[PDB]
């Protein structure tokens, strides 16, 4: 299979404005939201039909309780960081946990935290350590590293549990996640500012979002600057992107094991 990932995010906001919740937690399988929880709904809900159809009420019932607990723990952790930093007003606290199952069968695992959207603590499952970005993070790291059982638990979660959940969700969403929708690629030539010809290579209607696009002069990569367009969601479950140059040129597209050449 291709590279797939499972990730869960937590967002905590102290003193939030009207509307905005105090806590949001959302899960993703690749680019696909799979689950959601916030401090307003107070319920874990599916964000994909294949999640809703395959996971029994007891999964959602149990996880809602865990999230109600995690919500509370986040509110307290943010109050302690603000105390530490001597910060008043509204501030954010974030977490990202997750794992990847690579094509070759190997795995990656990660657990990170941010304060005000900047890196705070990064977990090293290989040395059972926390990388602190500053003196406040260092106080947390010292506290966190004292429980060796918690560190070991986390290494097992990232390596074994996370991978098992990913494989499980990959099967549920098989028809969405494992499908391939090839791109429709066109080349557009234009004489822009007098004497300046811009060649655009536009790709659309593709799934998965990972595509590789490049320009070539005679069969060697254009040492001139290539302007790359972002991979954008089209809104129908497919993605779009582009790549441009200024001037024998050819556009090269590689998507899901198929290479495509568009000569000019």
């Amino acid at each position, epitope marked *: 299979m291709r590279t797939h990932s499972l990730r869960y995010f937590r967002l905590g906001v102290s003193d939030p404005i009207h509307g905005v919740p105090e806590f949001i937690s959302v899960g993703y399988v690749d680019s696909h939201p799979i689950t959601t929880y916030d401090s307003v709904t107070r319920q874990k809900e599916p964000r994909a039909p294949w999640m809703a159809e395959n996971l029994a009420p007891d999964h959602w019932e*149990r996880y809602t309780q865990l999230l109600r607990g995690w919500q509370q723990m986040f509110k307290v952790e943010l109050k302690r960081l603000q105390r530490h930093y001597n910060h008043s007003g509204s501030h954010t606290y974030q977490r990202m946990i997750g794992c990847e199952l690579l094509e070759d069968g190997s795995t990656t695992g990660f657990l990170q935290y941010a304060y005000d959207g900047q890196d705070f603590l990064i977990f090293n499952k290989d040395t059972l350590s926390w990388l602190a970005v500053d003196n406040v993070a260092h106080t947390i790291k010292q506290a966190w590293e004292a429980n060796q059982h*918690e560190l070991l638990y986390q290494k097992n979660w990232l390596e074994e549990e996370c991978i098992a959940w990913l494989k499980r969700f990959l099967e549920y969403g098989k028809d969405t996640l494992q499908r391939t929708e090839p791109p429709l690629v066109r080349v557009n030539r234009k004489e822009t500012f007098p004497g300046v010809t811009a060649l655009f290579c536009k790709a659309h209607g593709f799934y998965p979002p990972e595509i590789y696009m490049t320009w070539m002069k005679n069969g060697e990569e254009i040492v001139q600057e290539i302007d790359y367009g972002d991979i954008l969601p089209s809104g129908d479950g497919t993605y779009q992107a582009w790549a441009s140059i200024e001037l024998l040129y050819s556009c090269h597209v590689e998507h899901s094991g198929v290479h495509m050449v568009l000569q000019v």
Partner: antibody
Framework: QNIDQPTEMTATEGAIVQINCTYQ??????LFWYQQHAGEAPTFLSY??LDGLEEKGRFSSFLSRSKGYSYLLLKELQMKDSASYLC??????????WGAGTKLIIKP | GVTQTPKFQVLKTGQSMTLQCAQD?????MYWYRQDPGMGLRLIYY???????DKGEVPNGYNVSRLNKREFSLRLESAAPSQTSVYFC????????????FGEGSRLTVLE
């Protein structure tokens, strides 16, 4: 789903006893061992989540995640070690599955 | 640690009964179990955090109150002889496998 440990075990004072525990859980977040003396509350003994043997005095706990088993080893047995030993395993949903216990009898 | 009351109690079938539990360890999660012969601890109800509770394996004939962060009561609506058991209250710091701390236990006997 299922945690299995012997109902009872009898060993001789001064000797070693290994209380086995096999788990068949839907996911795994760690294995616990608790000691419960007759008519008393259970108290935490050990926790294992990764493969290996963890020693805490005369007591040691081992885990084999591939083999799906654990053991609680008691060395230099004393009459005081006569209690029920409770095995508990945690689910992929952070739920504890409690074993029925093992009554350990020490023959003086 | 965990403080539960009473250690012993005799009840006539149909009587109401409240079991109190308090922890002063700043633990978040709290549990009510029943210990019966030949079986592992059966969870009645749990409270993952202050402000939430949920049913366990055996919730019928029981209800609970997470009064505050410290306290977790267990009520027997109408005592039945099947409810003759030993009840344990437990508390955990977190939910991710922090060790459980047990109350002294409460032996309840329900008689016609």
């Amino acid at each position: 789903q299922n945690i299995d440990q012997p109902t009872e075990m009898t060993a001789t004072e001064g000797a070693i006893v290994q209380i086995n525990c096999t788990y068949q859980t839907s996911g795994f977040n760690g294995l616990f061992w608790y000691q419960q003396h007759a008519g008393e509350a259970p108290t935490f003994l050990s926790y294992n989540v990764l493969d290996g043997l963890e020693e805490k005095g005369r007591f040691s706990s081992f885990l084999s995640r591939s083999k799906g088993y654990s053991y609680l080893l008691l060395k230099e047995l004393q009459m005081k070690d006569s209690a029920s030993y409770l095995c508990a395993g945690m689910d992929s949903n952070y739920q504890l599955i409690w074993g029925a216990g093992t009554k350990l009898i020490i023959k003086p | 640690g965990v403080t539960q009351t009473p250690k012993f109690q005799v009840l006539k079938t149909g009587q109401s009964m409240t079991l109190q539990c308090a922890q002063d360890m700043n633990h978040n999660s709290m549990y009510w179990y029943r210990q019966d012969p030949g079986m592992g601890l059966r969870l009645i109800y749990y409270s993952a955090s202050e402000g939430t509770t949920d049913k366990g394996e055996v919730p019928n004939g029981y209800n609970v109150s997470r009064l505050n962060k410290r306290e977790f009561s267990l009520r027997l609506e109408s005592a039945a002889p099947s409810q003759t058991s030993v009840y344990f209250c437990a508390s955990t710091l977190g939910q991710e496998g922090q060790p459980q701390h047990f109350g002294e236990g409460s032996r309840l006997t329900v008689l016609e």
